[PDB]
Design a protein around this ligand. Structure first.
Ligand code: CA
Ligand code: CA
Ligand code: CA
Ligand code: CA
Lengths: 105, 105
C-alpha cells in the first residue's frame, strides 16, 4: 500500500549526440513497464527544457519485490543494455514522499 | 489537457535546523492546494533519505493560468512568507514530460 512503496528519483545525464536514440529506448521501456507490471506504479520521466539531455524520473514501485522483478524483465534489459554507452551520469536517490499515496488528478 | 500542462521540478535545500517547521508549512500548503484548486494537478514532494533537507517537488499545473492563480492564493502566501528565512537554495526547472498525461496507478 502507500506506506511501503519504494519511491526513488533517478537523475540521468545522457550523451547529447545519442539523445534521440536514448529517448526511443526509454519511452518504449516505460510504456511496456506501465502496461505489463502491476507493481510499477509510475515511471514519470521529464527532460529539463534548458538541458534536454538531463532527465529526471520519478519512480514509484509497490514494494522492493516489485522493483527487483522490474529490473529482471526483458524490457528493462533491452533499455539498460541498449543505452549503456549513452549514459554519462546516473544518480539514484532513494526518497520519502511527504504525502504517501498522493495521486495526480 | 495533457498537451499544455505546465510541468516543473522545484529542488529546494532547507536550513537543517528549520526542517520540521518547513515540512509543517509545506505539507499544509500542498494539502490545501490539492483540496481547493482544480488547476493544481499534483504537488508531489519527496525528501532525499540521505539528506532530508533536500526536497524535490514534481509540480503539474493544468496550464500557466492555473500556476499564476496558485501563487496568488492565501495558502501559497502563508507558505512562501513563513519559510522565506528557511530556504538556502531554490532551483526552478521547467521540464517536458516524456509521456504527457501519464498517471500514477
Ligand atoms: Ca506498497
Ligand atoms: Ca558527446
Ligand atoms: Ca492542461
Ligand atoms: Ca543552519
Amino acid at each position: 500500500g502507500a506506506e511501503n512503496n519504494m519511491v526513488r528519483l533517478s537523475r540521468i545525464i545522457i550523451d547529447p549526440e545519442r539523445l534521440e536514440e536514448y529517448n526511443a529506448y526509454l519511452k518504449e521501456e516505460i510504456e511496456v513497464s506501465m502496461r505489463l507490471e502491476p507493481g510499477v506504479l509510475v515511471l514519470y520521466a521529464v527532460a529539463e527544457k534548458e538541458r534536454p539531455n538531463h532527465v529526471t524520473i520519478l519512480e514509484i514501485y509497490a514494494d522492493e519485490a516489485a522493483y527487483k522483478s522490474h529490473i529482471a524483465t526483458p524490457h528493462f534489459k533491452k533499455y539498460k543494455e541498449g543505452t549503456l554507452d549513452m549514459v554519462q551520469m546516473l544518480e539514484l536517490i532513494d526518497a520519502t514522499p511527504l504525502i504517501p499515496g498522493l495521486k495526480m488528478k
